[PDB]
Amino acid sequence: MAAVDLATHPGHLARRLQQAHYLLWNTMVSEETTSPQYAVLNALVAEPGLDQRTVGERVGLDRSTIAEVVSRLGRRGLLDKVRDPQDGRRSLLRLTDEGLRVHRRLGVRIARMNQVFLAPLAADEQAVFFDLIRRVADAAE
Template sequence: MDRRHFAVDVRLGGTGAAGGTIRSPLLRRGLAERVRDPLDGRRNVLKATGEGARLHRRPVTRTARMNRVFLAPLDQDERETLLGLIARVTDAAEDLRR
């Protein structure tokens, strides 16, 4: 699952313990359900339920609002540069954890 998003269509490729650590609570809480992958019918993917999608929207909306407030002093190019740099640092840190 993309570590930054619990998207409406959550695709979990991992089958090990780490994947189970992510999947199990989502399934147990009714935030996701198993469905056949429309691109590869041999595997299952998780799809957000209505409640899971609703729950995801709240922090996404808040984050967008906070970004507008905090990044207001920057012009669009500066915002894109800053967010791109933050994404690179975050990706590098994630790679170190693997």
């Protein structure tokens, strides 16, 4: 009988934001490297030799998605996977030179995407936006 106003539904806005993100990424950044792949590349630039489990916890990707990403980056020779010598049943991840090279290249394009993405907002609003969305994203903790 009664329809709802989707403009007040956070999930509706969430889907549309991610679609916009997926569009901007494939248009301005890459059709080969996905954003979760970049996220993993970045985590390994920040902390070389990081445990695969820890990488997942850091960039917000589950254990299966991380395994998939690591496999794909590995196949492309952007990433090296090695057994943790101390804990033989743990895996450590390091970027190759080409992996670092890909990460650097994409970062230039991403910087352009983000300016496009954030252009509708004033500077003070951008900070607020970052804070609010992160807090709402943690609602599924």
